[PDB]
Amino acid sequence: LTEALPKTGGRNNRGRITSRFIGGGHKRLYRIIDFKRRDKSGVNAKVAAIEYDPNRSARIALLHYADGEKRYILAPEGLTVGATVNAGPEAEPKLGNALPLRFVPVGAVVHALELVPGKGAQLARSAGTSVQVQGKESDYVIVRLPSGELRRVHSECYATIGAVGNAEHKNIVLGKAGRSRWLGRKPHQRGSAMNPVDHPHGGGEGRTGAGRVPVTPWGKPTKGLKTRRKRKTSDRFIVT
Amino acid sequence: SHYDILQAPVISEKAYSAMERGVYSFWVSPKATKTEIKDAIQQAFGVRVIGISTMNVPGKRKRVGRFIGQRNDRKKAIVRLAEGQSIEALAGQ
RNA sequence: AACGAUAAAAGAAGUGAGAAUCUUCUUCGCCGUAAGGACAAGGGUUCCUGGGGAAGGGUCGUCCGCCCAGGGAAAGUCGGGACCUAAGGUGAGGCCGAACGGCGCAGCCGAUGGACAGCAGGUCAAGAUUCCUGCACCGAUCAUGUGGAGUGAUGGAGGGACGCAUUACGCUAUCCAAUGCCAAGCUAUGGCUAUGCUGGUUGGUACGCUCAAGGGCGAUCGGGUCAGAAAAUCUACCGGUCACAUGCCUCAGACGUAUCGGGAGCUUCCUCGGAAGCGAAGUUGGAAACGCGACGGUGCCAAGAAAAGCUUCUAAACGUUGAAACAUGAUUGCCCGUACCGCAAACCGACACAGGUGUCCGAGUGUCAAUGCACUAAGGCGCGCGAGAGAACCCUCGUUAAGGAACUUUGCAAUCUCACCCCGUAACUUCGGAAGAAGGGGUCCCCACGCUUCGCGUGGGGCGCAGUGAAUAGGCCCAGGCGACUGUUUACCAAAAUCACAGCACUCUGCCAACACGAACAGUGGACGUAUAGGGUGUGACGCCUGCCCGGUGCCGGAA
RNA sequence: GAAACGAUGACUGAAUCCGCGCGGACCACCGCGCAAGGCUAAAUACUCCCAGUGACCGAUAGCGCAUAGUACCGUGAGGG
RNA sequence: CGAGCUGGAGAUACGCUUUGACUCGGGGAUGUCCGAAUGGGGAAACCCACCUCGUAAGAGGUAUCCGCAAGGAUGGGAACUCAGGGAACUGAAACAUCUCAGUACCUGAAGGAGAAGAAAGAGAAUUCGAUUCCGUUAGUAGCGGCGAGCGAACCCGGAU
Ligand SMILES: [Mg+2]
Ligand SMILES: [Mg+2]
Ligand SMILES: [Mg+2]
Numbered sequence A: 001l002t003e004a005l006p007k008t009g010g011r012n013n014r015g016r017i018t019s020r021f022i023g024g025g026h027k028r029l030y031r032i033i034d035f036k037r038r039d040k041s042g043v044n045a046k047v048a049a050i051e052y053d054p055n056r057s058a059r060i061a062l063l064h065y066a067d068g069e070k071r072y073i074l075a076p077e078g079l080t081v082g083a084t085v086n087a088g089p090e091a092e093p094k095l096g097n098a099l100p101l102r103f104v105p106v107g108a109v110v111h112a113l114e115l116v117p118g119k120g121a122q123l124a125r126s127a128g129t130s131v132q133v134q135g136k137e138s139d140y141v142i143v144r145l146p147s148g149e150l151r152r153v154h155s156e157c158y159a160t161i162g163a164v165g166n167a168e169h170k171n172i173v174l175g176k177a178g179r180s181r182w183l184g185r186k187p188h189q190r191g192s193a194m195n196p197v198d199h200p201h202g203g204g205e206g207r208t209g210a211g212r213v214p215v216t217p218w219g220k221p222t223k224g225l226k227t228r229r230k231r232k233t234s235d236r237f238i239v240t
Numbered sequence B: 001s002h003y004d005i006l007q008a009p010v011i012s013e014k015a016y017s018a019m020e021r022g023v024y025s026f027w028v029s030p031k032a033t034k035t036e037i038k039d040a041i042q043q044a045f046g047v048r049v050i051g052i053s054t055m056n057v058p059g060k061r062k063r064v065g066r067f068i069g070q071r072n073d074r075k076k077a078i079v080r081l082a083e084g085q086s087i088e089a090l091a092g093q
Numbered sequence C: 001a002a003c004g005a006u007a008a009a010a011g012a013a014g015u016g017a018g019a020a021u022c023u024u025c026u027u028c029g030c031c032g033u034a035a036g037g038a039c040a041a042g043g044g045u046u047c048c049u050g051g052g053g054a055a056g057g058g059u060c061g062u063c064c065g066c067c068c069a070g071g072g073a074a075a076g077u078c079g080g081g082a083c084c085u086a087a088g089g090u091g092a093g094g095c096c097g098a099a100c101g102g103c104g105c106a107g108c109c110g111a112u113g114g115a116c117a118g119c120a121g122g123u124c125a126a127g128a129u130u131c132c133u134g135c136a137c138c139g140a141u142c143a144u145g146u147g148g149a150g151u152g153a154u155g156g157a158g159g160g161a162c163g164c165a166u167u168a169c170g171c172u173a174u175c176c177a178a179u180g181c182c183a184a185g186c187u188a189u190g191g192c193u194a195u196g197c198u199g200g201u202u203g204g205u206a207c208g209c210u211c212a213a214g215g216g217c218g219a220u221c222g223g224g225u226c227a228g229a230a231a232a233u234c235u236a237c238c239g240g241u242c243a244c245a246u247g248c249c250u251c252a253g254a255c256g257u258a259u260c261g262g263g264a265g266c267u268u269c270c271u272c273g274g275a276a277g278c279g280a281a282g283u284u285g286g287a288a289a290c291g292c293g294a295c296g297g298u299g300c301c302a303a304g305a306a307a308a309g310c311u312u313c314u315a316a317a318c319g320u321u322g323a324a325a326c327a328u329g330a331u332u333g334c335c336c337g338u339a340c341c342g343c344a345a346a347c348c349g350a351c352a353c354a355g356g357u358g359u360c361c362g363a364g365u366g367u368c369a370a371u372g373c374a375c376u377a378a379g380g381c382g383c384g385c386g387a388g389a390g391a392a393c394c395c396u397c398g399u400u401a402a403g404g405a406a407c408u409u410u411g412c413a414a415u416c417u418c419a420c421c422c423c424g425u426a427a428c429u430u431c432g433g434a435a436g437a438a439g440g441g442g443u444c445c446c447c448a449c450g451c452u453u454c455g456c457g458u459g460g461g462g463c464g465c466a467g468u469g470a471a472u473a474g475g476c477c478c479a480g481g482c483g484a485c486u487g488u489u490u491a492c493c494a495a496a497a498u499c500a501c502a503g504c505a506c507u508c509u510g511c512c513a514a515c516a517c518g519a520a521c522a523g524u525g526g527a528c529g530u531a532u533a534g535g536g537u538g539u540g541a542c543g544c545c546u547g548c549c550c551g552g553u554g555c556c557g558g559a560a
Numbered sequence D: 001g002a003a004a005c006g007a008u009g010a011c012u013g014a015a016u017c018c019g020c021g022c023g024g025a026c027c028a029c030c031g032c033g034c035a036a037g038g039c040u041a042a043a044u045a046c047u048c049c050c051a052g053u054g055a056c057c058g059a060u061a062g063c064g065c066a067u068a069g070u071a072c073c074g075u076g077a078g079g080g
Numbered sequence E: 001c002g003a004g005c006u007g008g009a010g011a012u013a014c015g016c017u018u019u020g021a022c023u024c025g026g027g028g029a030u031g032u033c034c035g036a037a038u039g040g041g042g043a044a045a046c047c048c049a050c051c052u053c054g055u056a057a058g059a060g061g062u063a064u065c066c067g068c069a070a071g072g073a074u075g076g077g078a079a080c081u082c083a084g085g086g087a088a089c090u091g092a093a094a095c096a097u098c099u100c101a102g103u104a105c106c107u108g109a110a111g112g113a114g115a116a117g118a119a120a121g122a123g124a125a126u127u128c129g130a131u132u133c134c135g136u137u138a139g140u141a142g143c144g145g146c147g148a149g150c151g152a153a154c155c156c157g158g159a160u
């Protein structure tokens, strides 16, 4: 427990509620976690400890740089306490090392990957995830994202060797209700158990099931949502 | 100056039977921070003050007339000079 | 018809034009985790004194929370402000907008939280950590001495910084017992005669090689450039050195001495009942916090504010003759609140309304325990109509021959059961449970004996109809529908088979994500998250499962 | 609408005297006027305030008010 | 201005008035606190600062926007004026055009008045000749689910 900014609940913006549900809590805090990890490249550090922190589902490594400063950094599946972390293109592609893709061996399974030089990590970071490399092209690398997708990425971007783990939300069965309350307000409210007024799947004497749409009028099963833009060219194989 | 501010002497009996012990009390003005007042008095009766104490007071009366009343608000003040007891004679009153 | 809860009232005496209804006395009865006490908020003078007697007071009223007049409220340290910050509010300069205006970093406002110097008594008719009395503490400003030198920021670091459950040890507040101590007297009804009865039986401060559980702890040297924007004699990291034990540092509290106060009562005057003066003892044994020691121990996951004060550290800086710091004196101390009601005739309910209101204190005896239940201290109160009568009927209770669900839509209602020991306890079961299953027994008093003590066991004895002897105090079982479960809901006719739920499934979403609020290529929420994530929809523990029909609509893809 | 001209958000984009606009699509002829700079009395409107008047009222009328936006009701806007 | 005055108040006391009070006219001086409010905070009338002038008491400045600078602006006005934005009931015996309307309401700006104004005009006479207002033309021309219904201008008279 140490050196972290305070987090405050809030499930809606300026005026009213925006992202339904979510209201419970516990008071959790925020721990600034190094993602971009460049200003520190060129300095070795050791796993002082792996603390378990919320707002993440992902162990947290408390690294210490020769500089003297500490910096929490996601903990990949494997690092024990006391090992070594080193940033900068000059780094043995091992667990915890952060080295851009250009310098990353094909078939190498890494996470914490960015999408644009800096602004921190972005892909592969949530509890146990693995984005492996496919095979450099020109300036961009082909990689496989946890959703089974293929995106070019200019190898200019660092990455962390290895895959996160923090065990696995597989046996975590949240027991009975109220565990969800240890986190977010009573989940989903069956709009089919509301009123013609309140939502599309309202009324009906008895029990319904027609039209299939979201709280508003769109459709939820198999209706595309992404639009026509840039990244679009920079992408390969959305479906599946 | 000095002679200003004070508003009148607190008659009552306690006050009076409070005088017999060299504790003089009178009605100062509502706005009249405990110091100004401490000053004024000294220089109006020539004498210092070992201690002071003051607090505000509301009013709201009438006899009749659908004219209810209205506060009148005062600020009794109570002082204590140095062993050199008494003030003028407006004490032995 | 009503006079607003069925907690009762009686007599005497007094006042008065007039009193059931005011005052005094003596009794009775009701509350006592309160119907006592202290605040908050809210209300304001409702407080105290003297008058009053229209109207208000469900009745009288000579009285009142009502009317009139006067009085009352006192703080360097208690709360708040001149200090801090949270949500949120606002916001120069910025981003947006038909107008009005919408957002927004720093900054600022903003407690309900942080921080911070006093205690013990006395006492006006009415105030009190505010006034007095005793002793104390804090800051500030000056003088004197000591000192002999730096002082050290709107900046860095350290720290303030913080959960839930359970738990060891010492202690106090507080409470209990006694042929302890002090004081007052009397006792008679049959007895006691005091080893009876009643009452009191220490609070503050200062010193004491006194006792004392518990609790806290690295310092130092150096290294490195890459860390704290910078600087550092600070902080972090690296390593060296001693960090077993321990050791220190600190003492909740007790004890002794001193001293200050208080102390049952005593005495005196009396204008009728206050006023004034004085004063004893302070033991041994037992219990004991939700507090104190302390930011104690263990365990647990859903993983538990910020900011200033504070501690150290430099920048800059004036200064190293006269510094910072200590002490001893002195002077100094601002504004606002402090009366009274405050679980209630003083606040919200149109009424002095059977309701509603946050926090704290909350005695004793008995009963495993207890903030339960019964009685009762302190204290508070008998509820602002009263008296008779003793019919029908209505409400709230007690008992009821014989029968025992025959009642009836339904055993609705009302009984039975009813606590704590011991013995005993089915199907079925996710092996937890079903269980307090079901059923049976005990339970008081005396004495001896032994036990771990309050208490209890063993044996004998005793009394009643009866011994959790009075109050609190499960009726039980078989079988089926629905829903798995705890939970949630129609404030004022529906609590449920409703909703939610853990679990499952489809699908959308590549991250300025899908999606949603919005005048807006602003801002923001999703998320300071990133696909084992987030959105949407349906299903709803667990178990065995879940088929056939894509003509039609939709959704995806193809696409001449 | 056959519908001109004025106007403007969006794209465009001219001339200048043997020049430019219009005279209700459109053309010629005929005709009236010169746009893309500006300031300007006066007659016009209303009525908080003032005076005068009234085949206006004279107290359930007249203003809500012989005065009060008070009492009283509402958390408030507000009503009164 | 000349006997009275001492406010409504109907009261008592004290008093003031020809070196003409009082009252009426007309200029000055004072004018706490809040309020655009503007030193900073603020749940209005309260709470806290600072700099300067200084006997201290006490005085004054301390807001944002335009401008060297004077100096101007922020606020408030019953209705009237223009402008930006702009309903619905209702009619049409229903209703979507259309009507009700560009009215009601919101907002901005302004004054005592505004707005408009000195012609790339209207008109058919080769006429008038800034704007505005009243009369008339006329309910004519025309607009219109050519339905409901809406409704000009020139000329001419007059204010100026
Ligand atoms: Mg009776
Ligand atoms: Mg069945
Ligand atoms: Mg259920």
Ligand SMILES: [Mg+2]
Pocket (backbone or CB within 6 Å): none
């Ligand atoms: Mg339930």
Ligand SMILES: [Mg+2]
Pocket (backbone or CB within 6 Å): none
């Ligand atoms: Mg009459």
Ligand SMILES: [Mg+2]
Pocket (backbone or CB within 6 Å): D065, D067
């Ligand atoms: Mg009036």
